From a paper:
The spatial organization of the tri-snRNP proteins in pre-BAMPPNP complexes was the same as in the CE pre-B protomers. In contrast to pre-B complexes, in which the RecA domains of PRP28 are in an inactive, open conformation, in pre-BAMPPNP they exhibit a closed conformation. Consistent with the absence of additional structural rearrangements in tri-snRNP components, the 5′ss of the adjacent protomer is not base paired to the U6 ACAGA box. Indeed, the release and transfer of the 5′ss to the U6 ACAGA box would require ATP hydrolysis and lead to the release of the RecA domains of PRP28 from U1 snRNP and PRP8, as observed in the pre-BATP complex.
Numbering used by the authors:
A (entry chain A): 613 to 658
B (entry chain U): 114 to 201, 203 to 556
C (entry chain A): 224 to 362, 369 to 501
D (entry chain A): 1113 to 1335
E (entry chain C): 105 to 956
F (entry chain G): 242 to 255, 270 to 356
Write the structure that this text describes.
RNA sequence: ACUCUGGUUUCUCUUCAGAUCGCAUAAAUCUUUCGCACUAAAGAUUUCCGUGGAGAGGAACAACUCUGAGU
């Protein structure tokens, strides 16, 4: 925000630079995946 | 009175070990032996106009650079560099007159205290006990016996063989300026040559320290070869023939057990090794009173304690996934047997020290009743007598290490603290729970 | 497979021109002095705080000031004070301005300044003395020509035909000093998630006059980066088994191709 | 002492016992001559009495010196950690007679030759905290009046013994406030099951004759 | 030998045979300013010499930075000498005893060590940055050291690609650099033959980043290989300078024809380089093959697919081949050890060249007495043993030989400093992998192993049982003086012996490092700057003494100084009242202190020369100048002892009987100082009169020296004294847009910006200042932090200045944590020094006086 | 500041899901002015930071490099620079010409 | 300038990899650390996120441009 929203483009909802948050949540999902997968596999046994 | 040449031989300001020259008036040690050197400046400034070179062993007037010649000063040189004559190194048993120090304290050579620099009690005791043995004391009292040792140039372990010799020579000085010697140099060398183990800050196990020192001395006495016939290896190391075996299995029937008993899976083998120290294990306290034994300290006879090493007495080892039921046998006895009773063990949640007493007669004893039958008559002499005992009194965590040593020359078995020398009755020697004992086979 | 990406110099120049807005336009890494990964690691390990950087819990518990009592080498009445040694002056020379600097990674000394006069107008020639460069003051026992130092008629400079400038010459010399992806000319196609487009902005010093919230956000990002860097245990040697390829080998899976929107809707329905 | 126990590594100061209660400015300062002289005095005292009968350990004891490098002579008598600071070294520091300070004047001149700053010894504060903790824990089924009486007795003893030093030791005042808060919380729990939002001090501090708990507290509980 | 060495173009047996030759060894040091390119140039030399060792694409293969501190800190820490065999331009193969010294101003000690074990210096100048403070300092030191110099220009790639100056402007910048170097040389040179120029063949143009080393002769030979039948020497004699080439006449015209013909150098040398660098770095994909075919180089598809910078390095290495030009220039300028033996013996070797032993050493005959000399003492990998390093001036040191290692003070009269040792197992001077050897012929550099026991700083190994009339090589004289002091103590005093052993080892390791223990028991160790001491601690606490050590705040070694004349006549008497000396103190005439300290006014000369140099330059009276006694604290000291005794009252012979004692006492006093126990500078103590008894038992001996010291202290205290502090010249190189910030930063450190100026050809200016060292701690961090990491600075103790206040001022109070103001500095400095040193806190004018 | 500097010198001598990191946990409060107001990274008057508006970044320049450029450039160089600036302004106007409502 | 083993792409499997295996960055368990641990550090372990090396097999289209080699 504080970088893009400068000059003619002031404060607003038009900031569409989402790669950083996407990367952070992708890393979080990749880390979380083994635990959730193990839980789901344990749930469906026999 | 102020001359103490026990610590490191360095300069006051220069902090260099080359061309040192201690001051015979100012007490401290400086460097140089002439003008524009630290010694001349220290002599001019402090008016201390008498200096002796720690290497040249000559007394010179440093401000005037005129070497002095007075035989009355030979005491300072003797205290700085204690040299034992060829015959004087063998008259240690003829110690009749008490050696009075330059201070106001009569004493006897060998019975001297090593200052307890922090928790140096274990190392000080081990050193004062190992110095009692006439073999090692005589070997270390002659610098020629170790000066020409071919050690690698880039080795630090050679300091242990060199520093221990200086301590042994100082502790046997008949005309020492003081009545005690500081183990600072030897203990510092031991700390440096042990990889942060057995330092002077935190006390260590006496048995472990003795074992490490003996191994270092054996590996340092030999030089540029695998010469196992070291002075330490010849004076305090013997041969034990462990006719050891193993058990097949506790959870197997008769057939499966006999199969391994016959297929050499539970066979008896002779693995004879060199037993430098015989860890005679004391039995655990019963932790229960009885009708007898008005004192609640469980006594134990030495003969029963030492009979475990005999051939008949079998011992079990709880090895991983096996019942190693072994049995030892002393093939050959060393001239000075060293026994270290492991009076401290580790419990399931702590580390307790067994308080059982070792009823060991300190006059005469023979191990021929526990020796190997093969060479029983080969060892002509078997009447061994205890020479020195080191007892670790007190709690395991906070404990004191006292040494009860039987002095030669006289017959009194003096008990020595860190810096206090007392007299102990022979019957009282067998009372304190001993930890490490060294006996002479006579 | 998209494993190698080697483009020509003009292509990389055009890519850098189309992306110079997101690039920090730096030349010498010396502009990040006492603000690099090593500096942050040394600050964290010394229980100090670089003002422009983050701060974490001490690695080793530090005793209080009163734990020592006016030691001969710790007497305040003997130290001459001229300027207070800040945390920067300690994180810069850890071995001289920090007692017991256990596990203190040193930082690289100043690399020579990259004096690269960046181009500003394509019209100007490639190797031209720009006004930014300070002028050189034009103020040799040269032998006389009376001798017979005559060269053969075939002797010529090696690149007489090759010009001293070119259309791509100035642009090519520009790419020498550039962010790493622009600096290289042949690379491997990294993963999309593995290419942070904003890391260099956070790594640099915070912009001047930023609000307290922005400064705190930058400090937190630096803390996260330093934590992910100090814990960079190298990966272990796996057997290289591909779960996706394994499921593909399984007879209970089919293969097709569909738009990401349709696949996302199908995945949402499947999750529901 | 050096002849009978040399320390060429200057390790005598590695173990000298200083008082962590007083600030670093007033403590022994651990000098070169000071530490060695203190160790020498401790040894000479220990070397007099035989160790067989009774020995004064060099660890649990305390030898403090005052000299050119140590301006404050610190002592700990009768559970009152004091620190005498002579006016010869306390110059350029006016005399503000706070409760904690104890102006020790001269004998003949009757002038203030020093100032014996006093403070409750940490052992006494630890004992008081242990007593308060035991009273709170061993309250059990005892009536609130009994707990209040026990707390009042403890506070009366603490304040009457350390009459002056209870003010200088700001740690002691904080401990007293914490103990009073803990006792009030225990009483409130005994009365109200939940946490009472600012229960009035009238319930606690009212005298026994009027029906209150009769709590004697040294806190700043403004009515 | 049964040794093991990395594969090399030459042969180990061939290298040993070449070493056996006495007139083919190049003893050179690659002196150069910080980050000039010296280490990378040695790396290129090694890469050519060692085929296996190659440079990584990104990280340069620093094969001359062995120490971890130099490996990570970036700046070179110590000199890693390398002795390797490399070919020349003609084709003959030499061996080079190179020594890659560091460029940091603080680490000038290693440079000073290198010169005493070398015959010539190869100065390194960065093309983009020109001459720097370290470059000028190294030039001055080398020329003062009386050694050959061969300036070379590196980092030309910066001009060709970063700065992008036109070829004519490039030649202008190079000519300005050479002119500045020559002018700096002539400021201190003596013989006019010491000139440097590409026309004279004492200049090389290199680029370590891409292996673009060449010269006029080598590049003319490149033309010769490309064309053929070209006289390389005569043509290269016309390839440089203002002369222009005329194609019509096929001759080079002194007067420039056609009104558009650039200089010969730009026309032939710069143009092609520009063209090839532009093609490689700007138009590789399009016109790479055509240019390569024109130049003749062929590169495979893999080699031409590299990144721009490694590809440029490969192309330049193919084009220029070996570094023949550098070797040719070194052979031309830097003489052989036999040729340069006489200058070395005359300069550094003591005992005189004309002496019999001096003549034998000057002969440089391996079949002669062994009189080697070890400058630096290197440390083994384990850090336990030390390996002394030096070059044999004569004889042939061999393994297992018994030697007599004369120490740094093993004089002839008092040989007590000698220590007869047995050197053995010595290797050759390789950089990253030493190679063993059986013997060491006279001229090569030998890394002995075993003579390190008495070798503290510098020593000369001699031959026992022979050469009984021998002297010890003169101790090193460093460029600058150490002024920073830092007390260090172990955190746990139990490990003090380990820390002091490590301190002795690190004192041996660093040449200029000074260590001592004061009366307060502090373990003070000196040092040139700040990064110097940081490296000292990073080695002390992690390499030699692995314990943790606590270091106090850095300080500056203050020096005493008298301002006014002696207040009155001080009558000091020796004990027993047999002698009564009297000395009157007076400050020395301005400039005379710096003249004595620069060894210009050498008391070693005879009476006539010293008298003339004192009566003429110093304007001293012809009778006053004829009664000098000594030279204050040291041989080159800022104090002068003058025998001002009136002959009508004092017998000359009787005074001479106490002359030695008086001189020794004066030296001791000037070394000690009466105010803060510090060296007294810029004083002229004159013995006004003296009473001397007859018998030596009553007069002199142990009584005159203490009386002399007391009289000196009383004289230096009676005259109004003043403490002095070191002022370190700082040359901050910053962009002209940031010079204002550089001036602002130096404002808050009591230092004035002496001179600001832009760098000719470079956008970055070079601001020069003089910040006092006392408040200069951390100044580099502030300068590089207030400028956002765009300015770097160095420091060197230029001179000393009087403290703003008065030391003997009892009316000024102090503070434990508040910096004393400007007028309250001298008294605060004196009190804090006397407290840190543990001396008495009061030094009155009647402290050492006779009456009290 | 000054009192803070002296106090710092003396010092050197001797549950709840918080969403937004509070400003209390921030750094860079330096007493010294030299380490608080430091000269920015002016890339020789030809570069600036990333992300920020290029027009805004160039507008807020220090003008120190611009003064040297306008007082050192040659007359022909000045004319070429003026032509380039005119071309850039024309390009901006063309961008401004495409904006309408 | 004559000839010559030598094509790349792509799919799959095995095995090795402490190299910044990756110019990116998570998760979980234990252990030590002060709590009274999203808001916390340290040490270890493990699983994912996906790689590089080599080998083996497979199907598409290049057959010598290329380069190394046999002149
Ligand atoms: O606190 P700031 O960083 O100044 O930002 C706050 C607010 O944050 P808080 O929740 O902490 O008040 C939001 O910004 P975030 O910090 O949450 O991103 C909000 O924007 P959103 O609700 O869209 O997130 C807006 O920030 P901005 O002005 O950048 O849109 C607002 O700013 P102000 O408090 O300055 O009005």
């Amino acid at each position: 925000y504080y970088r893009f929203n400068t000059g003619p483009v002031g404060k607003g909802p038009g900031c569409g630079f989402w790669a950083a948050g996407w990367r952070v949540w992708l890393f979080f999902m990749r880390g979380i995946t083994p635990l959730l997968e193990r839980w789901l596999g344990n749930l469906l046994a026999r | 009175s102020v001359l103490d040449f026990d610590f490191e031989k360095l300069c006051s300001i220069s902090l260099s070990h080359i061309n040192a020259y201690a001051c015979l008036v100012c007490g401290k040690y400086f460097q140089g032996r002439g003008l524009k050197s630290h010694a001349y400046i220290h002599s001019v400034q402090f008016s201390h106009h008498v200096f002796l070179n720690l290497h040249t062993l000559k007394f010179y007037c440093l401000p005037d650079n005129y070497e002095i010649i007075d035989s009355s000063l030979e005491d300072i040189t003797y205290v700085l560099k204690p040299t034992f004559t060829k015959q004087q190194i063998a008259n240690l048993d003829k110690q009749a007159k008490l050696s009075r120090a330059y201070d106001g304290t009569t004493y006897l050579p060998g019975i001297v205290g090593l200052n307890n620099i922090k928790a140096n009690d274990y190392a000080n005791a081990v050193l004062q006990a190992l110095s009692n043995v006439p073999p090692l004391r005589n070997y270390f009292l002659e610098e020629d016996n170790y000066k020409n040792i071919k050690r690698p140039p880039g080795d630090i372990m050679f300091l242990l063989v060199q520093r221990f010799g200086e301590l042994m020579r100082k502790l046997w000085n008949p005309r020492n300026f003081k009545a005690h010697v500081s183990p600072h140099e030897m203990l510092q060398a031991v700390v440096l040559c042990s990889k942060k183990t057995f330092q002077i800050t935190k006390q260590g196990d006496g048995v472990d320290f003795l074992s490490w020192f003996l191994n270092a001395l054996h590996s340092a006495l030999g030089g540029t070869k695998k010469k196992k016939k070291t002075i330490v290896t010849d004076v305090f190391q013997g041969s034990m023939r462990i006719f050891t075996k193993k058990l097949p299995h506790p959870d197997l029937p008769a057939e499966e057990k006999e199969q391994l008993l016959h297929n050499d899976e539970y066979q008896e083998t002779m693995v004879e090794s060199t037993f430098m120290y015989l860890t005679l294990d004391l039995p655990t306290a019963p932790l229960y009173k009885d009708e007898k034994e008005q004192l609640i300290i469980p006594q134990v006879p030495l003969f029963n304690i030492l009979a475990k090493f005999n051939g008949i007495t079998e011992k079990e080892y709880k090895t991983y996934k096996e019942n190693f039921l072994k049995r030892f046998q002393l093939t050959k006895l060393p001239p000075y047997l060293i026994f270290c009773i492991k009076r401290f063990t580790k419990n399931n949640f702590f580390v307790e020290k067994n308080p059982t007493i070792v009823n060991f007669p300190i006059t005469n004893v023979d191990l021929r009743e526990y020796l190997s039958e093969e060479v029983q008559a080969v060892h002509k002499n078997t009447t061994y007598d205890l020479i020195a005992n080191i007892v670790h009194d007190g709690k395991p965590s906070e404990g004191s290490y006292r040494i009860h040593v039987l002095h030669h020359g006289t017959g009194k078995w003096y008990e020595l603290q860190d810096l206090q020398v007392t007299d102990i009755l022979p019957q009282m020697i067998t009372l304190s729970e001993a930890y490490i004992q060294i006996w002479k086979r006579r | 497979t998209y494993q190698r990406w080697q483009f020509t110099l003009p292509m990389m120049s055009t890519l850098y021109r189309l992306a110079n807005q997101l690039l920090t336009d730096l030349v010498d890494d010396n502009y990040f002095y006492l603000f690099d990964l090593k500096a942050f690691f040394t600050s964290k390990a010394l229980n100090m705080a670089i003002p422009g950087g983050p701060k974490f819990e001490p690695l080793v518990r530090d005793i209080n000031l009163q734990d020592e009592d006016w030691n001969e080498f710790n007497d305040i009445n003997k130290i001459i004070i001229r300027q207070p040694i800040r945390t920067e002056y300690k994180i810069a020379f850890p071995y001289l301005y920090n007692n017991l600097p256990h596990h203190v990674h040193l930082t690289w000394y100043h690399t020579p300044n990259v004096v690269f006069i960046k181009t500003e107008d394509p019209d100007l020639p490639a190797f031209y003395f720009d006004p930014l460069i300070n002028p050189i003051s034009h103020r040799e026992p040269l032998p006389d020509d009376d001798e017979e130092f005559e060269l053969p008629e075939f002797v010529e400079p090696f690149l007489k035909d090759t010009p001293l400038y070119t259309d791509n010459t100035a642009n090519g010399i520009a790419l020498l000093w550039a962010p790493r992806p622009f600096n290289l000319r042949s690379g491997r196609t990294r993963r999309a998630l593995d290419i942070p487009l904003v890391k260099n902005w956070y790594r640099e010093h915070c912009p001047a006059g930023q609000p307290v919230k922005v400064r705190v956000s930058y400090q937190k990002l630096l803390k996260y980066y330093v934590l992910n860097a100090l814990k960079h245990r190298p990966p272990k040697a796996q057997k290289k088994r591909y779960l996706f390829r394994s499921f593909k080998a399984t007879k209970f899976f089919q293969s097709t191709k569909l738009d990401w929107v349709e696949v996302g809707l199908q995945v949402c329905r499947q999750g529901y | 002492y050096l002849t009978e126990h040399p320390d060429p590594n200057n390790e005598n100061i590695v173990g000298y016992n200083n008082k962590k209660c007083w600030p670093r400015d007033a403590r022994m300062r651990l000098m070169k001559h000071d530490v060695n002289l203190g160790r020498a005095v401790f040894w000479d005292i220990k070397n007099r009495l035989p160790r067989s009968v009774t020995t004064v350990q060099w660890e649990n004891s305390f030898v403090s010196v005052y000299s050119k490098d140590n301006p404050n002579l610190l002592f700990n008598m009768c559970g009152f950690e004091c620190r005498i600071l002579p006016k010869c070294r306390t110059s350029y520091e006016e005399f503000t007679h706070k409760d904690g300070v104890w102006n020790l004047q001269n004998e003949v001149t009757k002038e203030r030759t020093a100032q014996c700053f006093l403070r409750v010894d940490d052992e006494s504060m630890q004992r008081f905290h242990n007593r308060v903790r035991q009273i709170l824990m061993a309250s059990g089924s005892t009536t609130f009046t009994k707990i209040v009486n026990k707390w009042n007795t403890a506070l009366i003893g603490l304040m009457t013994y350390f009459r002056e030093a209870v003010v200088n030791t700001q740690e002691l005042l904080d401990l007293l406030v914490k103990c009073e808060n803990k006792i009030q919380t225990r009483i409130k729990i005994g009365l109200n099951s939940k946490m009472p939002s600012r229960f009035p001090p009238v319930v606690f501090y009212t005298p026994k004759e009027l029906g209150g708990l009769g709590m004697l507290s040294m806190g700043h509980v403004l009515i | 030998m049964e040794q093991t060495l990395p594969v090399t173009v030459y042969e180990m047996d061939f290298l040993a045979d070449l070493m056996d030759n006495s007139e083919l060894i190049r003893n050179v040091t690659l002196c150069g300013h910080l980050h000039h390119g010296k280490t990378c140039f040695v790396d290129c030399l090694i890469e050519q010499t060692h085929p296996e060792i190659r440079k990584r694409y990104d990280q340069d293969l620093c094969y001359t930075d062995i120490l971890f501190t130099e490996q990570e800190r970036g700046v070179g820490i110590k000199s890693t000498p390398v002795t390797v065999v490399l070919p020349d331009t003609k084709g003959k193969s030499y061996l080079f005893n190179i020594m890659d010294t560091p460029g940091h101003v603080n680490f000038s000690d290693e440079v000073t060590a290198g010169l005493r074990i070398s015959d010539g210096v190869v100065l390194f100048i960065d093309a983009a940055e020109g001459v720097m403070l370290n470059t000028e300092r190294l030039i001055k030191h080398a020329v003062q050291e009386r050694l050959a110099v061969t300036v070379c220009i590196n980092k030309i790639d910066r001009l060709i690609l970063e700065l992008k100056l036109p070829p004519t402007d490039a030649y202008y910048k190079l000519r300005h650099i050479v002119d500045e170097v020559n002018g700096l040389i002539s400021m201190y040179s003596t013989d006019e033959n010491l000139i440097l120029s590409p026309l004279l063949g004492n200049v090389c143009f290199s680029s370590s980043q891409y292996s673009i080393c060449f010269t006029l002769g080598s590049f003319a030979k490149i033309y010769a290989d490309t064309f053929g039948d070209i006289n390389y020497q005569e043509f290269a004699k016309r390839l440089w300078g203002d002369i222009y080439f005329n194609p019509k006449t096929r001759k080079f015209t002194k007067k420039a024809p056609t009104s558009s013909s650039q200089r010969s150098f730009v026309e032939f040398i710069l143009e092609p380089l520009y063209k090839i660098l532009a093609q490689v770095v700007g138009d590789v994909d399009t016109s790479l093959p055509r240019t390569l075919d024109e130049l003749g180089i062929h590169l495979t598809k893999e080699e031409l697919k590299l990144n721009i910078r490694p590809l440029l390095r490969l192309v330049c290495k193919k084009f220029f081949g070996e570094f023949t030009g550098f070797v040719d220039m070194c052979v031309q300028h830097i003489p052989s050890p036999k040729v340069g033996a006489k200058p070395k013996i005359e300069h550094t070797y003591t005992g005189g060249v004309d002496s019999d032993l001096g003549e034998a050493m000057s002969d440089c005959d391996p079949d002669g007495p062994l009189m080697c000399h070890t400058t630096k003492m290197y440390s083994t990998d384990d850090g336990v043993q030390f390996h002394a390093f030096g070059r044999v001036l004569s004889g042939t040191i061999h393994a297992g030989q018994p030697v007599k290692v004369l120490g740094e003070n093993y004089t002839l009269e008092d040989e007590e400093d000698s220590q007869i040792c047995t050197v053995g197992r010595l290797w050759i001077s390789v950089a990253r992998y030493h190679i063993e050897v059986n013997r060491v012929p006279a001229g090569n550099w030998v890394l002995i192993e075993g003579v390190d026991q008495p070798i503290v700083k510098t020593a000369t190994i001699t031959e026992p049982r022979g050469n009984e009339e021998a002297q010890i090589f003169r101790p090193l004289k460093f460029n600058t003086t150490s002024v920073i002091k830092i007390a260090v103590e172990p955190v746990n005093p139990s490990e003090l012996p380990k820390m002091l052993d490590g301190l002795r080892k690190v004192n041996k390791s660093y040449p200029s490092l000074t260590t001592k223990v004061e009366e307060s028991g502090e373990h003070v160790i000196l040092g040139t700057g700040e990064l110097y001491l940081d490296c000292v601690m990073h080695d002390l606490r992690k390499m030699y003494s692995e314990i943790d050590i606590k270091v106090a705040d850095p300080v500056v070694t203050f020096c005493e100084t008298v301002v006014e004349t002696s207040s009155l006549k001080c009558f000091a008497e020796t004990p027993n009242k047999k002698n009564k000396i009297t000395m009157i103190a007076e400050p020395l005439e301005k400039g005379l202190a710096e003249d004595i300290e620069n060894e210009v006014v050498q008391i070693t000369w005879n009476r006539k020369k010293l008298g003339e140099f004192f009566q003429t330059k110093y304007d001293w009276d012809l009778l006053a100048a004829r009664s000098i006694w000594a030279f204050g604290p040291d041989a080159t000291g800022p104090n002068i002892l003058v025998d001002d005794t009136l002959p009508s009252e004092v017998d000359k012979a009787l005074l001479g009987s106490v002359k030695d004692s008086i001189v020794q006492g004066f030296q001791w006093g000037t070394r000690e100082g009466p105010l803060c126990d510090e060296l007294i500078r810029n004083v002229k103590f004159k013995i006004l009169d003296a009473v001397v008894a007859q018998e030596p038992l009553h007069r002199g001996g142990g009584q005159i020296i203490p009386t002399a010291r007391r009289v000196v202290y009383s004289a230096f205290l009676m005259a109004t004294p003043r403490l002095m502090e070191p002022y370190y010249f700082v040359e901050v190189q910053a962009p002209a847009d940031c010079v204002s910030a550089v001036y602002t930063v130096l404002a808050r450190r009591r230092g004035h910006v002496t001179q600001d100026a832009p760098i000719p050809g470079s956008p970055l200016y070079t601001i020069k200042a003089f910040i006092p060292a006392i408040d200069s701690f951390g100044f580099e961090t502030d300068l590089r932090t207030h400028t956002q990491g765009q300015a770097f600075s160095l420091s060197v103790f230029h001179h000393w200045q009087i403290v703003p206040g008065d030391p003997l001022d009892k009316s000024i109070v102090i503070r434990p944590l508040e910096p004393q103001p400007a007028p309250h500095l001298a008294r605060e400095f004196m009190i804090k020094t006397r407290r840190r040193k543990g001396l008495s806190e009061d030094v009155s004018i009647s402290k050492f006086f006779d009456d009290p | 500041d000054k009192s803070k500097e002296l106090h710092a010198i003396k010092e050197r001598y001797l549950r709840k899901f918080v969403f937004e990191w509070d400003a209390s946990e921030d750094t860079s409060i330096d007493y010294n002015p030299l380490y608080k107001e430091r000269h920015q990274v002016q890339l020789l008057g030809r570069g600036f930071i990333a992300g920020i508006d290029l027009k805004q970044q160039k507008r807020e320049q220090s003008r120190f490099y611009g003064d040297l450029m306008e007082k050192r450039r040659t007359l022909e160089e000045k004319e070429q620079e003026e032509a380039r600036l005119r071309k850039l302004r024309k390009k901006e106007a063309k961008q401004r010409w495409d904006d309408r409502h």
